[PDB]
Design a binder for this molecule. Structure first.
Ligand SMILES: CNCc1ccc2c(c1)N(C(=O)OCc1ccccc1)[C@H](CNC(=N)N)[C@H]2NC(=O)C(=O)Nc1ccc(Cl)c(F)c1
Ligand SMILES: *[C@@H]1O[C@H](CO)[C@@H](O)[C@H](O)[C@H]1NC(C)=O
Ligand SMILES: *[C@@H]1O[C@H](CO)[C@@H](O)[C@H](O)[C@H]1NC(C)=O
Ligand SMILES: *[C@@H]1O[C@H](CO)[C@@H](O)[C@H](O)[C@H]1NC(C)=O
Ligand SMILES: *[C@@H]1O[C@H](CO)[C@@H](O)[C@H](O)[C@H]1NC(C)=O
Ligand SMILES: *[C@@H]1O[C@H](CO)[C@@H](O)[C@H](O)[C@H]1NC(C)=O
Ligand SMILES: *[C@@H]1O[C@H](CO)[C@@H](O)[C@H](O)[C@H]1NC(C)=O
Ligand SMILES: *[C@@H]1O[C@H](CO)[C@@H](O)[C@H](O)[C@H]1NC(C)=O
Length: 335
């Protein structure tokens, strides 16, 4: 309804690039924030049409332009060349704050699916701290649901609409390029993956009740959406999830179909230099990988799915506003 500002813990003395950007663009966080409950009000939210998401998307585009400069950027006809130094890159949390005379309304219902009316509301001046993590298929390093796994969609009957699964317990994923230069792998505990994909099948079943629930690898598209892609320490990883989204949930029981080995699923990955950009339609070329071991240890805290008797779900992604939505869903600017 208005333009918001960001607050952060960044420090002007980190040269990590999120820190640099935030110290120029954000104000410091209030050490003790005000929050004002109101259990009577009942207030309508819509996470799928929330202008906080558009403002955040702008900010993160700006951060990546300042920070992860490509050697070449192809946008349509044009090709732009610049210095592409290797940088230190680790996302930090960002708070979005309402300016003077507006407030941010927070929905306090633990199972609120992001849509419709909400009974227990609050007024705050800033959101919680949201780490702007760019990735597909798996949402990393977010904040888990309080109670049960929530299923969010602008419209579950429209199978073109992305489904956000909000996990209530996180699942560890560890990706490494050991000391090819391009070759890397990720490891997930097959047990924890089994467990969470069962519970996700249960919630999906509540919404599609006759049908069998199948998980299957992403069909087609750019490598960025057909693998789980993400930035780790500056380098762009592309990890094959064919052994991860691979399993059936038949009779209130889940059966994993993908290959494990000693109780860990291992995704093969490549570090790539030609990137399809998430900010706009365009390509970006980066320098070859840094030296040594490149490792990220992340929490899978949500999933992005697309639905095709039987209902089949494939990993989705590609529109980073859904990443921001998965965090901003309980908030609304007012007044
Ligand atoms: C229903 N939604 C389907 C969908 C599928 C695929 C995409 C979108 C949307 N895009 C999308 O919405 O852009 C936002 C937008 C919206 C409206 C108008 C313009 C732009 C992307 C369009 N950009 C290209 N074509 N170059 C494409 N996504 C990626 O390229 C991607 O994620 N790359 C990547 C790079 C690095 C990392 Cl680390 C990473 F994790 C991922
Ligand atoms: C979310 O809840 C609303 C009612 O609050 C309901 O109308 C809508 O269908 C639900 N959507 C999903 C994806 O569960
Ligand atoms: C998370 O939610 C699921 C499904 O809604 C439920 O079965 C499970 O017990 C919950 N787990 C935890 C750790 O709260
Ligand atoms: C969402 O789903 C379908 C589109 O397939 C359509 O009936 C309408 O847009 C929506 N329906 C409901 C119940 O929201
Ligand atoms: C879940 O993973 C463990 C580890 O391999 C396995 O022993 C167990 O049988 C699996 N459960 C399934 C596939 O339902
Ligand atoms: C992932 O690996 C499988 C089997 O190794 C292969 O068939 C599939 O095409 C791969 N997908 C991508 C996007 O690399
Ligand atoms: C599941 O994994 C196996 C081996 O890891 C693979 O052969 C199979 O094609 C995968 N399922 C699908 C639907 O791709
Ligand atoms: C997730 O957070 C951990 C701890 O801050 C970090 O080491 C890891 O690299 C993060 N993952 C991504 C993809 O940013």
């Amino acid at each position: 309804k208005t333009t918001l500002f960001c607050a952060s813990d960044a420090k002007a003395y980190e040269k990590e690039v999120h820190n640099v950007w935030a110290t120029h663009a954000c104000v410091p966080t209030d050490p003790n924030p005000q929050e004002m409950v109101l259990a009577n009000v009942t207030e309508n939210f819509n996470m799928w049409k929330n202008d906080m998401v558009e403002q955040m998307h702008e900010d993160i585009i700006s951060l990546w332009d300042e920070s992860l400069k490509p050697c070449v950027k192809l946008t349509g006809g044009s090709a732009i060349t610049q210095a592409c130094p290797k940088v230190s890159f680790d996302p930090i949390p960002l708070h979005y704050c309402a300016p003077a005379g507006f407030a941010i309304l927070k929905c306090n219902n633990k199972t609120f699916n992001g849509t419709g009316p909400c009974r227990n509301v609050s007024t705050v001046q800033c959101t919680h701290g949201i780490k702007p993590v760019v990735s597909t298929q798996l949402l990393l390093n977010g904040s888990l649901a309080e109670e049960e796994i929530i299923i969010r969609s602008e419209n579950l009957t429209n199978n073109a609409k992305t489904i956000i699964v909000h996990l209530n317990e996180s699942v560890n994923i560890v990706c490494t390029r050991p000391n090819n230069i391009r070759q890397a792998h990720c490891n997930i505990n097959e047990s924890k993956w089994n467990n969470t994909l069962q519970k996700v099948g249960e919630e999906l079943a509540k919404h599609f009740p006759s049908k069998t629930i199948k998980f299957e690898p992403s069909s087609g598209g750019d490598l960025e959406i057909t693998t789980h892609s993400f930035n780790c320490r500056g380098e762009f990883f592309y990890c094959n999830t064919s052994d991860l989204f691979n399993g059936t949930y038949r009779n209130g029981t889940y059966n994993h179909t993908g290959r494990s080995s000693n109780g860990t699923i291992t995704l093969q990955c490549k570090i790539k230099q030609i990137i399809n950009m998430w900010q706009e339609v365009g390509r970006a070329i980066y320098a070859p990988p840094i030296e040594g071991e490149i490792t990220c240890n992340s929490n899978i805290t949500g999933l992005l799915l697309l639905r095709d008797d039987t209902e089949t779900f494939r990993p989705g992604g590609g529109d980073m506003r859904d990443n921001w939505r998965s965090e901003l869903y309980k908030y609304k600017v007012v007044e």
